[PDB]
Each structure stands twice: as structure tokens, then as C-alpha cells.
Enzyme design. Structure first.
Site: not given
Lengths: 178, 176, 178, 178, 178, 178, 178, 178, 178, 178, 178
Positions: K5, K38, K163, K166, K169
Site C-alpha cells: 500500500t 495500515k 493514485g 501509479c 495505488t
């Protein structure tokens, strides 16, 4: 990654000489110091031994071997065997690809971490990055040139030729004799 | 292996030098004396080449050719050299690189069609290339007044000689 | 999987000699012929050439060079490089790992498909499986034993020495001179 | 870096023999030694054993196997198995590529670090560098030349042959009979 | 994916023989065929030739070589060289790993795509899968069993032996005599 | 460099049989013993086990399982998996590529060091160098020839068939039943 | 990256059958179509041929081979040879790892881009991803089950078993007969 | 994928300096840190030390060697060896490629996980990313600038040149002295 | 380091659709384009075609096959083959891993540089990055959704699922019909 | 051997900027040139283009494309498509991993030797060593900072950021406009 | 197998933000989870931390570090150093390529299993799959957009950009503060 310095030992005309160079090569291409001394006398100068590899490796072996000597009363034959055995035993030591030469007045041997012990027929031994060129040089001299040269002169020379052929061997050359 | 060549623009002097070491395969040296640096264009220029002697003289000729066509403009003639080198099939496969210099400027030309001009006026190619260069730029920068071009060029290779296994101490130096 | 023979070429005391062993090794293990002839005089006996590799390539490169020879007023230097420029040219031949030695009364040259042409500093050239060994032996003798050995003698010795050590070189050795 | 010597063993006409050459090749290119003793009798001369590999290793296994020979009261088969088990077990010895041939009057076996135990049908065993060549030679003789040779004669000839072909095998040869 | 059959050739007591097995193994694991003809006479029965590899290839080379045999008026040596040259030349054939043995009454040779030409000193040649085993066998016999066998008998036995040992060689065997 | 023997196990027409050939292949090329015994009855003759690999490992795994057997009221299923959990546990044994077949009058299981335990759908299991060939042969016979062949007959055939095709399987085949 | 479909041909009880599956596998894991028809009749139904590889490759071969037939008057022996020769000639075609089966009333052959031509002893041929399992199945049946099955039934079956063993072979099975 | 900072040490004209850059490169492409503390005075300021690798490794090492010194009463040479022997002893650290420079007012030493201990001939050591470039510059200034530059100046200058050249070295430079 | 867009074709209930996404990924990590024109009506709108790879390759191919159609008078099946034969013919294009889908109102075909031409059994083809995911979704909807979805709907839906799952597929989707 | 320069292009609020850094890094760590100009204006200063690769190639390409521009009457799109066909066609040039950016007032495009042609939807492109890092920053700024920044501004800034992070991008930066 | 992540951290104008995306992509192309958490607050909500790696590991680490925080009385620096020693020490954990970001009001740090501890000078950190792309954008925005943006704002934005570019992402993003 360090490259093994070159060592040569010879029994000629009732003389024993062992020489080595000073070159220290890190990685493929790089030289850290030119002055290394890889040859020494043991057993109160009774034996000449040399090791191509690391410094701390140099002495741990030298230590435990002279051990075999004292145990075996300076019998190079039995000590080197018991040495090679004990070398072959150690988890961290079997790993060393560098090898060990030993010699006294009587003879010379080669000991490896694989438990090998070798005695030459021509009384010439050479190890290290350039050992082979050195071996080619010395034999040539000893066999063909036999009466025109001493051991000190054969040994010294053998390290010069290899010094010329080989990239990992330099011209600072320490010579010991028995 | 490729011999080590060093070029320096210093104090109005133009020097280029190189070692003589010829390394066969892995550990083996065939020859210590090879001369890799030569004057061209009736001595107006210095050139050096890392690799094969055969490929040395083709490129040299090839370049000197450019120089004649381009009226001795190193800038222009080096570009055209690189294009051409890049065009030839078997030559554009050459790893070894080429340094040209005149009194005015120096250039580095590759078979990849690259053309490099150093901003510090120091060019070095070959095995000990990085070693000579560092040595040279250090001197030039810091040791400036106390050393000449010929001296910096000699020293850099002396240093290249000691650190690098593929650079020996038999050294020729040229000057314009 | 073939292993090149070992050729040695020396200029010494105003004399010249080129020699080679005959051993050929197929597979990494096997030896078939003990005696092989790859060293040939060219240019009406004015030039000794030798090549360690395939007989087919051997003749090809030889004839090529004796061609290069003929064109050039027998300028050994120019002819070498003319062949060297040529050798690189051929897409099939360019790729050979093996090398050619060419010499005359004056000097010797080491020619490769890479285009490299090399004149030795000490008047000694060596190629093939045992090249380095003989090279080391010969240099040793030449430099140290200089007074006592001829060109002929140094060559034979080197290969013999090479034969003693290298598994790929044997003792069947022919010697040609100019 | 060492190349194994060559060992051969044959049951013939109620005779047993084991034999080995002296050649020791270190580096894929180079011969260190022309002699050694890697075939030694065991168990009061009742058993011959041989091991191609290093000196410290042979000594360890021979010792290992002989200790087995005693526990089981001279059973070559049970021994070799317990030999093969323990060898397979030892983390340091498990890795060994070289193989062991043990032999008595009635039978002969081959042991490996993988815990293998092999009994030839024809009573001919060969290990080390020239095993392939010495195996083929001796069988060829044993089957076809049967009438004209003894076990001694066969083993001497097999190694003489491998020594003739294999670059890593030479003619300095010891033959042991039970 | 195919494994080569095995070919052997021997000059003995003024007799010539060439022989081959039938086993064809495709896939590293599997046998396709137990027979074939890869040894065929040439040049009015004066020459035997054999080639371990594919059918279309053998036919091409045999044809290639035989055409050479004629141009040069039955000279096996000159032929094999021009054979080796042309083979070395052909871009498609240059790549071939399998080798060719040609033979006449006086001599026998081995040719490869690399442009190699090999003349055995002892007049025994073997190629293909079990070459190593059949070579060792036949020499072993030729030297040691000399009195008791013929060339026919030797070649039949060598392949019988390789066929006994090598997993890729079998017992369906043709022998050709000149 | 060893090649596993070939074991075949079949449950057919209310009968059970396990069989294997004897061929052992060292190197990729060489065959030493034609007849090998790796298939063993266990649990006082109530269970047939077989293992294609090293005799040392063979005994180890066998004894292990007959151990697993003893604990469990001879529940073949639970014992397999108990061994399978165990086999994975051992760091030395876990790493074996070879597999174990265990069966009884009721059913057969395929146990691996990976921990896998497999019961076949058709009542046939095969392992070792020729496993797939025999497996294919046996399934063919069982499914198609079902009326005309017994368990015993199907096994022998499969291996024989395996022997015919696979270079690593031979025709010396022992058959055990329950 | 496509995976070769599986084809089988059989001469049994005076009948000739050839079958193949329909599975088309792209990359390692992926199936594009299950219906592929890889077997066909040529020479006006006089010959059955099949090819494991690509579709456009299938026909170019089929084309030039029937050419060899018409040239050679439906002699499968000479045509396949001339076929394999012409296959071996083509720069783009030698590349194909897939192979070709051909058969008529009289016989069957296997042709490869390496210039190989193979005729089976048992009159069974199988190629493709699963050929080996198929071959194991058919032989087993033909030899052992000989009087209980037809060729159509042996062929069909052989592709089923392989269909069960193999991941790259499916159960859509086209069968032709002569 | 981490790149060491660069560290340089020099003994010059009765003084000593050790310096380092601040650049820490993550991936081959990326910088986060411009500065750090990697060269740490030990033994109550009596010795200088720096290590190119991770902070955690360093602080292990530094404290470890700081231990050795105390043990050995400040002997730099004897301490280094017992560290190295210990460093190479630990099987987690022995894997460290990065090396350690230790320095006092007399001599300097370079220590590797291999067990190597090296005393530069010139009184100059460099480690880390720009390590080669630093060493070149410094030796250049020590030998040809000798009169005009001090230890600290050279340390500053050497790391200044590397940062100009080495992509992994920047211009944030801190010099420590004894 | 480029990633193909995703293309999906379906023949369903008397209608046809071909669709594609817009995502073009550079490196494994990066997107620049959200859209393109990769599925192009050919043959004056009578056939649909799409290709996953580069624009330049596509326009070569498209026009090339558009050529074949004209030549062959619109026969989709015969055109495909001559394209493939041609595609595989050219040594620059034959290297293309990417594949071509061609479609008319009757059947659809999948063409690769290898020479493969494939007619899906289900009337569904997909190519490019999310190719596997599309094919799964579409076949899922065609077989279990059959009544409730149309061709265009399924094309839209299949590429909709891939874009949800495949990291290389997005939601910009254009559907073409015949 | 060399590392590509980094070029960034942006369309923002009606203005075009293409910028590049100067750094040329040869070999893993070594920076040869602080200032490079590889971004050229073409087509009467109506077109910006840049190529991160070698200077010679920059010429050939810029040359090639300007011809496409003119042939196509300033149509950046078809000139890009045609060039990409030519580029992909060239045996020499096709091999180039470096890519080309071309842009005019309306649009911006990226082209490669694989024949790909790319139009970013957000009108930002980046290539060369910091290609990734420059794009993000630019796209970051353009999107969020849109009100406060211009094209030159974002262009200058982007490479500034890239040069701050990317080890292989310096701060000597040239910006261009339209 | 899974892809990390992406987490981004920023110190801007006196405020701290750590943010992450949700996307979890398993296998090369496949996205398993749209939303992941996370990033955890620790030490009475005084400390932000994130780990791009597996959920379990996130626990163990966060656990491990919070202990270091407390042992060290909230000293983020020594708690980071000690943890990195423990981490580097753990045989299991040391192997983790994924990295940890920890931050409080004053500073931010990055830690790895190699024992490295990193403090960015510009108070921006990024890890995981878009780690590079997020950093650039953030550093881009922080530097140039400083007046108009906050920490949360830059944090949210950075991952938004990551995001957007990538592939690995997504846009489901959680931001945290202090």
C-alpha cells in the site's frame, strides 16, 4: 571479494625459499594496499608458511596448525593432515577458498579447507591469484636452469614473472628462507 | 581490457596521456607499452582511444577526415563523427570511447552517438577512467598554481596506475 | 567442446623460433590425437605463423594473411593490421576466440578477430590452451636464463613445461625456426 | 578446485583388485600431484576401500565405515547401509559429491552422501574423474578378454586406458589385491 | 529433442570396421527407434562414413563429403579438410553439434561443423551418445586383447559395451567392413 | 546424479499388487545395477510400501511409517498423514523430491515430504523415473482391459511397458502382492 | 507459447487409425479453444497426417509434403525423406519444434524440422504435449490386449488416458482411419 | 537498495582527519537525507571511526570495537584483529559488505566482515559510495599537493571531489580530528 | 515496458460487438493515456478488428489484412490464414507477441505472429492486458446470463469487470458493432 | 552506459513549455557533463521536441520527424504516426529504449521505437531518468496549484523537484516555450 | 506476492499528516481489496505510524515500536534506533523489504529491517507502491504551493496524484493528523 595475493615456495640446491607479494585487491578492479606481508616463520623459525586469504584467517590457521606441530613434534606430514582435518571440521572455516602452504627443511605441503593435503614432486608449490604463472616460471628455471640459480633467486623471480603476467599480483615481494 | 586515457585543459596547456597496459581476458597482460594517444591534423589535435588498434586507426582516419571537411572545427567535426560511427553497423558496437582535444576545447565521442564536453576541461576514459578523473579534478581545483597540465595529466595516471589493476605505470603524454 | 593446441613464439639472441604441442582435447575430458600440425611457414618460408584452433579456420586465416603479406611489400606490421581490419569485417570469422601469431626475423605480432594487433615487449608471444603457462615459462627463461639458452631451446622448454602442468598440453612438440 | 583421481575395482576369477591413479588436478586447468594413497585396505586386510576425494574426507569415511564393519561383524552390506545412513545424516558430510567403493572377497559396493548403496551385477566399480572411461575399459576386457587376464591385470589396464584418454587421469597407478 | 546413436570405427591388423547402434531416444527420457542406417559406405565401397545426427543431415554431409572425395581423387585427408571448410562455412550447417567420421583402408578422420579435422593416433574413433564408453572399450580391447580379436570383433564389442552401460545406447548393431 | 527406480502399485478386481524394476542410473548416462530391491512389506506383511530413491532414505521413511502405523490401530489413512506431518517437519528429509507409496488390501496412498497425502481415484499409483509411463500403461489396461487382466498382471505389464520406452527403466521386475 | 495438441497413430489388426485432441493452450496456463482438428487425410484419402503445431504451419508442410508424395508416387519412405530435407532447408521452418506424423496403409513415419525421420517398430507413434502418456497407453494395449481391441479403440483410448494424465491434452478427440 | 554515505580518512603531516558526506540514497534513484552522524569518536575521543552502512549495524560495531579497545588497552592494531575475528565470527554480521575504518593519532585500519584488516601504505582510507573517487582525489592531493594542504583540508577536498563526480555523494561534509 | 489495452469480442444471439478499454500503462507502474482507437472497422465496415499492441504495428497489420480480404473477396477464414502465413513470414513482425482479433457477422478469428489462427468454440475472443479477466467475465455472462444480456452489453460488461480487477484495465470503454 | 537526461512538457492555461536538465551521468555513479541541450524547436519554431537519448540520435530523430511534419503539413498527429512507423521500421533505431516527446500549441505526443504513440489527457509528459518524478510533481502542481502557476513555472519547477530527488537529474535546466 | 500500500507523511507549517490509500493488489494484475487501514496512531495519539506491508507485520512492528517509545519516554529518535536494532536483529523480520514510517509533532522517521533510520530534511516521507510518485508531488506542493495548502491537504493530494498515476495505488484514502 578481496583477491588472493600470490605466494611461492621452493626447495632448491639445498635451500628453501618462500616468497609472496604485497598487493591487496578489493572487488574486481581495486587495490587498497601494496605492502601486505603474507609469509612468516613458525615453530621458532623452523617452518615457513603462507596464506593467500584474509589477515584474521591467516592467524587463526597459523595458530591451530602450529598446534598440530607441537602436538606432532614438527612432523609436517602428520601435522598438516591433522590440520586439514580440523580445517574441514569448522563451519566458518571450510568456507575459505584461499589455501595454505607449509614447509620446513625437509618438505612442503599445501592445505585447503576442503581437507586436501598436497606434496609436490618437483618441490615447487605456488598458490594465490597468480600461482599458476609463478609455478610455470619456477619449474622452468629449476628444471632447465638448475645450476645457474638459487632458491631465493628462483622464488623472487617466479613472483616477478607472475607479477608481469598477472593483474592481481604486484612487485612488492617479501622473501623468506630456511 | 581498455587502457586508461586522460585529457586536461590547464593553464593554457593541453595535455593528454594514457597507460600502456593491454589485458587479455581475465588476469592476463599481453603488453605493457601500447601507445594509445596520437597527434592528428598536422599535429593540431590530440586524440586517444581505449580499445583495438585496428578500430583505433579507422576512427582516427574517420575523424581526421571530418576535420578536413569541417575546416578543423572540433565541435562540428566531432558531431558528424558520432553520427557516422553510429551509422556503421559493426563499429557502433564498440564499447571503447574516444577523446579529442584542441587548444580551444576537448570532446568525448562514443559509438552510442554521444558527444560530451567537460565543464571542468578534464576528460578521462577507460578502465582507470574514474580514478584519473577524480585525481585530476582534485589537483586542478585545489593544487592549481603548483602544477602544470602535463604534470596533472602525469599524476592522474600515476594515481590511476595504483588504484586500478587494469592501468599500469608505463605512460605516454602528449602536448599541443 | 574442443581444446586448442598450445603455440609458443620467441625472438631471442638474434634468433627466432615458433613451436607447439600436438594434443587435442574433445569434450572437457577426452584426448584423441597426440600430434597435430598447426604451425606453418608462409611467404616462401620468410614468416612463421601459428593458430591454435580449427584446421579449417587455420588455413583460412593463414591464407588471408599471406594474402595481406603479398600486397604490402611484406611489411609485417601493415599486413597484420590489414588482416586485422579484415578479420573483424567477416561476420563468421570475427567471432573467433582464438588468435594468430605472425613473426619474421625482425619481430612478432599477435593478431585477433577483435581487430587487435599486438607486438610483445619481450619478444615472446603465446596462445592456446597452455598459452599462459608456456608464456610464463618462456619469459622466465628468457629474462633470467638469457645467456645459457637459445631461441630454439627456450621454446621447447616452455611447451614442455606447459605440457607438464596443463592437462591440455602434451609433450609432443615441433619446433620451427627462421 | 580439485579434480578427483580415478579409482577402479574388479572381482575376477575369484580375485579381487582395486586400483587408482596418482594425478591430482587443481583448477580446471592444472596438475598439482602425480601420487597419493586413496585406496587403503581395511578390516585386517579383508576389505579394500577407496575414495576419490580429499584426504581429510577419505580418512573420515574409511574410519567411519570401518567402525561400521566391526559393529556388524564383517558384513559389507549391512555396514555400507549404516555407512550410507550416517553419511546421509551428517550435515557437513551429506553434501559430498565424491563416492566410496568398498569391497571384500565375496562382494563390492558403492556408497554416496545421498545415502545410496549400489551393488554392481558384474563386479566392476569405478569412481572419480575417469570412472566412465575406466569402467568401459574394464568391462570390455572382463567380458571379451576374460581368458587372458587377471583381476590385477584388468584393473591396471582400465586405469592405463582412462589415463590414456582422460586429461585428468595419468599413469602413476597403485593396484591393491585382497 | 533427439539423442544421437553411437558410432565406432577401428583400423585393426589391416582390417577396418565401422559400427553403430539402432537406439533413437527422443526427449531426454524416451526411445523412439531401435534401428536406422547412419553408417553408409561411399566412394565405390572404398570409404566408410558415419554421422550420429539427423537423417536429412547425414545425407547432406555424406553427399557433401563424397563430392569432395571425387574432386581430389580419393584423398581422404584433403577431402575432409575441404569438407570441414565448407561445413564451417554454411550458416545453417555451421551450427551442427554432431560429428562425422570418415574412413578408408589407410586412414580415418573425424570432422565437425567448427571446421575441425582429427586423425586418431591409434585408429579408433567413436561419436554420438556412447562415444566415451565405446571409445574406452575398444581401445582397452585393441591394446590388451589385441591377439584374440579382429576389427569386426572389436567394433561389435565396443558398442555392445556402451550399449550395456549407456542408457541411450542399445544392442541393435550394424557393423560395416571395408 | 542418480536416477530413481520405477515403482507401480495397483488395486484391481479385489486384488492388490506393487511392483518395480531394478535399474539404477548414475550420471545421466551410466547404468550399474540391473536389479535393485526397494519395495518392502511392512506391519507383519499387511502393507506394501515402496520408495524410488536412496536406500538410506528408503529405510528411514519406511521405518518412520511403520512407526506411524503401529501407533494408529493400523488406520492407513491417519498414519499416512501423521507421517506426512512428520516428514515435512524434518529439515533434512523434508527436501526430498522422491515420494512414498503405501497401500493395503483396501486402498493406497501417495505420501510426499511436502506433506501431501494422495489417494488415487482409479486405484493406481506410480512413482520414480518411469512413473508416468507405467502410470499411463496401467490405467490403460485397468480401464480398458479390465476383464482380462489381474492386479498382478497389470503391474508387471506397466513396468515392462515402462522398461520398453523409458531409458531409465529396465525389464527386471519384482512383484509383491497382499 | 502455444502448447502442442496430442496426436496418436496406430497400425493394428489390419487397421490404421490416427487421433488427436482439440485443446489449444496459450502460454503456460491458458486454453483458447477446445475444438481444434489437427488430423487430416491427404493424397485423396490415401494418407493420414497430423501436426501438433500452428495452423498456418500445419498447411504449409501438408502442402509441400503432398508435393513429395506426388513427386515420389505415394512412397511414404522417400517422400518423408525429401520432406525432412526440405524442412531442414527453410530458415523459418527448421525453427518449428512441433513435428509431423504421416501414415498410409503400409506404414507410418515421424518428421521433424531437425531433418529427422523415424519409423516405429511397434507401429505406434505419438507426438504432442501428451504423446508419451499416449504411447505408454497404446503399446500396453496393442501388445498385451492385442486381440480385445481395434485400432480405432486403441487410438481413441490412448488419447483418453493422456487426456487424464496431461494438462495440455483435452477430451475432444477426432479420430480418422484408413 | 540503499546507498552508503561516503567516508574518507587521512594521516597527513603529523595530523589526522576523518570526514563524511550526508547523502543517503534510497533506491538507485532517490535521496531523503542530506546529513547524518556516521563518523563517531570512540575510546573517550582517542580514536576516530566511521562506517558506511546502516545506523543500527554501525552502533553495534562501534560499541563492539570500543569494547575490544578497552579489553586490549587501546592497542589499535590488536583490537582491530579481535574485532574482525569477532565480526567474521557472528553469522549475521559477517554478511556485511560494508567496511569499517578505525583511526588513532598513529595509524589507521580498514576492517571488513570477511576478517580482513588493512593498513594503507599511504595513510589513506575511504569507504562507501563515492569511496573510489574520494581515495583517488585524496591520494592525488597527498602526493602532488603535499606542501600546500593539511589533513582536514584533504578530507574536505577529497569528499568535495567525489560529491562533484559520484552521483551518490553530496556536498554536506563534516570533518573530525584527533 | 508497455502494457496493451484490453480488447474483447463476442458473437451473441445473432449480433456482434467488439470493445476495448483506454488505459495505456508505461513502465509496470504508470498511466499516461486514458483512451485510444485500437479497434477499427475494416473492409468498408464489413469486418471488425482490434490489436492490443503499438499503434504503428496495428496500422501495419490492419492495412495488411485489409489487403488480404480484398484479395480473397471477403472470405474471413481464408484471408486470416494468408495474413498469418505472411505475418509469420516477415521476420520483423513475427516477433510480435500481441495478437489480432478479426470479426465479421458470421465468425471471429484470433491471429498471432506465430502463424496460429483460432476460431473460439464459444464465439468469444479477448486480447491484451486484462485479456484473461475479460474472457472469464464474458464467457460467464454468455453461458449463465444468456437470456438477459446482448452482445454489446456483454462486451461492455466484460471489459467492465476486467477494469475492476486487472490493474492494467480501466473504465473507458468503446463498443463497436457490425 | 549513459543515463538519459530528463525532459518535461506541459500544456497549462493555454501555454506550452518543454524543459530539460543538463546532467549527463556515465557509468553507474559518474557525472560527465553538467549542461546538455537535447530539446529542440522545429517547424518554424512552431514545434517543441526533446529526446533524452544520445546527441546523434537526437539529430537523426528530430531530422526524421521534421520531415514528417512537413510531409504532413504540420499535422503533429499523422507526422507522429508515420515517424513511429519509420522508427519501428528502422533495424538500427527500433532498438532505442529512449523516447521522444513532440508538442505544438494544441497537443503533445510521445513516440517510441516500438511504434507506440501516446497522448496524455492532462497534457503533461515526462521522459528520461527522473521521468516518473517530474511527471508527478508537474501533474501535482498543474492540478492543485493551477491558479498560481504558469507553464514555464510548472515546467521549471517539475525538473527542479526531479533534480532534487532523482540522483540522475541536476539543476542546470533549460526551459522553452511556444 | 502482494503489492504494498502507499503511505505519505508531511510536516507543513506546523502540522502533521500521514495518509494512505486502500488498494491491495495481489498477483501481477489483480486487485483484491479496495480499502485497507495500515496507518495507526500510537503513544496516546501522539505518534503517527504506517507500514505498507502485511497486516500481521504491521501489528508486530507497531507493537514493537510502541514499546520502544515508552521505554525511551516518547523519544522518537532513540525508540527508532533501538527498534531498528531489534528489527535488524530478528531473523524472521529482518527479511522485510517493506518499511516503516513513524512521526510525531517535531520530526518524522523511516525505518527498515536492515537497521537503517532515515530523517528527511524537508519533512516529507513516502513508502509503498507509489512511494516515489507520492513524494515528488508532496515535495512539489509543499515547496511551491506552500501558502495555499495545509498538511492534510498536501497529504490527501499526494496520494491522490500517486493514485492517479501509479497503477498500484487507488483513490480510497484515509488521512490522519496530530
Amino acid at each position: 571479494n578481496f583477491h588472493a595475493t600470490t605466494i611461492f615456495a621452493v626447495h632448491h640446491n639445498g635451500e628453501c625459499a618462500m616468497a609472496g607479494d604485497g598487493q591487496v585487491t578489493m572487488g574486481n578492479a581495486v587495490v587498497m594496499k601494496h605492502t601486505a606481508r603474507k609469509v612468516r616463520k613458525l615453530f621458532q623459525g623452523k617452518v615457513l608458511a603462507g596464506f593467500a586469504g584474509s589477515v584474521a584467517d591467516a592467524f587463526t590457521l597459523f595458530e591451530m596448525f602450529e598446534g598440530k606441530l607441537e602436538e606432532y613434534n614438527g612432523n609436517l606430514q602428520r601435522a598438516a593432515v591433522e590440520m586439514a582435518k580440523q580445517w574441514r571440521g569448522d563451519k566458518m572455516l571450510r568456507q575459505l577458498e584461499a589455501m595454505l602452504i607449509v614447509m620446513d627443511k625437509t618438505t612442503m605441503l599445501l592445505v585447503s579447507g576442503t581437507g586436501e593435503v598436497i606434496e609436490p614432486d618437483d618441490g615447487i608449490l605456488a598458490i594465490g591469484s597468480g600461482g599458476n604463472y609463478a609455478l610455470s616460471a619456477g619449474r622452468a628455471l629449476k628444471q632447465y636452469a638448475s645450476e645457474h640459480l638459487t632458491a631465493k633467486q628462483i622464488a623472487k623471480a617466479s613472483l616477478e614473472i607472475a607479477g608481469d603476467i598477472c593483474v592481481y599480483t604486484n612487485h612488492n615481494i617479501i622473501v623468506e628462507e630456511l
